[PDB]
Curated annotation (Swiss-Prot):
Disease: Platelet-activating factor acetylhydrolase deficiency: An enzymatic deficiency that results in exacerbated bodily response to inflammatory agents. It can be associated with several disease states including inflammatory gastrointestinal disorders, asthma and atopy. Asthmatic individuals with PAFAD may manifest aggravated respiratory symptoms.
Induction: Up-regulated upon monocyte differentiation toward macrophage lineage.
The protein's role, per its UniProt record: Lipoprotein-associated calcium-independent phospholipase A2 involved in phospholipid catabolism during inflammatory and oxidative stress response. At the lipid-aqueous interface, hydrolyzes the ester bond of fatty acyl group attached at sn-2 position of phospholipids (phospholipase A2 activity). Specifically targets phospholipids with a short-chain fatty acyl group at sn-2 position. Can hydrolyze phospholipids with long fatty acyl chains, only if they carry oxidized functional groups.
Name of the protein this chain belongs to: Platelet-activating factor acetylhydrolase
Organism: Homo sapiens (Human)
Similarity comment text for this entry: Belongs to the AB hydrolase superfamily. Lipase family.
Domain of life: Eukaryota
Covered residues, full protein: 54 to 425 of 441
Subcellular location, record wording: Secreted, Extracellular space
Post-translational modification: N-glycosylated. Macrophage-derived PLA2G7 carries sialylated complex-type N-glycans that hinder its binding to HDL particles.
Sugar-bearing residue positions: 370
Length: 372
């Protein structure tokens, strides 16, 4: 695999958690500091139907689905599948929200890097029909047999976009808050039966969370989801929006976000109608920071930027002018510095405080889009 290993000192484990088993329950992929580092064997895209959904998302035919599966169906991401959680420390928690057409496993480069620095990361899978695909179970017996019900991305008419994208962002925010509540309840001993039968004992998570140190992060639609989530749920102490797509948000939200918020943008994705909405979040009584990564594209924040070579990836707009490892390192280091500042962590991530200010050859303070 060319998804980078995390740069921090902790070994990284990965598992999946679904509870309850229904379409209204929570589904997430967990990245976490692992006690041991025995093999990097997590499967990146774990089911054939995700490839089918990606093909529908792309507007391609039957054939693209099977082809993606042949190329990437056995690819790993560098985490220890179902490895025990590293004991004896409480970890800060990130809930992560994916973009339109994505699903929970496609931001492992970020999730694994955070976990390697001592975070637990809960990457939610949304059931708002913004994921290319997702699944749930119609009853407990279906969960026991592994009898999955698939839900695929909803395509919208233009007259639908304003109302449905706003309904979806509100559902997404609810799903982020629900995921946080599930993890906090497990932390304080709620018995949970994972609807997935996996060799990770969820009781390991009891007393494992630093409950004051919680953040929400997300890409694209997931960046709008950060803002909607912060507005509704003050258990989240700060947010980081990766190339936020601001269209889904209602006007009411802009004034209702007390928490610190960091915008990390790609150079080649942003446009004035979107940036003006980020600017609406600024106020002298609030902490808002923005940086833009030079030479990057929207896909630099997701794992398909690592899936292909330099030339095909550039042609497919999965890669920008900047090296993908260089770009994700800048985003991850700036994120860590921001998290340390606003969660009050006692780590050394303040070595990267300069990146929050845009002070790097590969960063722009603020944005290239000067509109206001």
């Amino acid at each position: 695999t060319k998804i980078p290993r995390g740069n921090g000192p902790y070994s990284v484990g990965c598992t999946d958690l679904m509870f309850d088993h229904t379409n209204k329950g929570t589904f997430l992929r967990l990245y976490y500091p692992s006690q041991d580092n025995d093999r990097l064997d997590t499967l990146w895209i774990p089911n054939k139907e995700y490839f089918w959904g990606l093909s529908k998302f792309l507007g391609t035919h039957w054939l693209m689905g099977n082809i993606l599966r042949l190329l990437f169906g056995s690819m790993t991401t560098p985490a220890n599948w179902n490895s025990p959680l590293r004991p004896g420390e409480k970890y800060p928690l990130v809930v992560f929200s994916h973009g339109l057409g994505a699903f929970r496993t496609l931001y492992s480069a970020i999730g694994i890097d955070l976990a390697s620095h001592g975070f637990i990361v809960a990457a939610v899978e949304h059931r708002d029909r913004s994921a290319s695909a997702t699944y749930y179970f119609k009853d407990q017996s279906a969960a026991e047999i592994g009898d999955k019900s698939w839900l695929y991305l909803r395509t919208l008419k233009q007259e639908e976009e304003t109302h449905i994208r706003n309904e979806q962002v509100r559902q997404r925010a609810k799903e982020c808050s629900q995921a946080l509540s599930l993890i906090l309840d497990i932390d304080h001993g709620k018995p949970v039966k994972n609807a997935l039968d996996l060799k990770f004992d969820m009781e390991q998570l009891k007393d494992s969370i630093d409950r004051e140190k919680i953040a929400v992060i997300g890409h694209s639609f997931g960046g709008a989801t950060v803002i909607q989530t912060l507005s509704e749920d003050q258990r989240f102490r700060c947010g980081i929006a990766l190339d936020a797509w601001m269209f889904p948000l209602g006007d009411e939200v802009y004034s209702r976000i007390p928490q610190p918020l960091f915008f990390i943008n790609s150079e080649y994705f942003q446009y004035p109608a979107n940036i003006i909405k980020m600017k609406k979040c600024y106020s002298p009584d609030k902490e808002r920071k923005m940086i833009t990564i030079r030479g990057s594209v929207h896909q630099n924040f997701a794992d398909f930027t690592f899936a292909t070579g330099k030339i095909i990836g550039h042609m497919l707009k999965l890669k920008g002018d900047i090296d993908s490892n260089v770009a994700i390192d800048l985003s991850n280091k700036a994120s860590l510095a921001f998290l340390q500042k606003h969660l009050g962590l006692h780590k050394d991530f303040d070595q990267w405080d300069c990146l929050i200010e845009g002070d790097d050859e590969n960063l722009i303070p603020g944005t290239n889009i000067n509109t206001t």
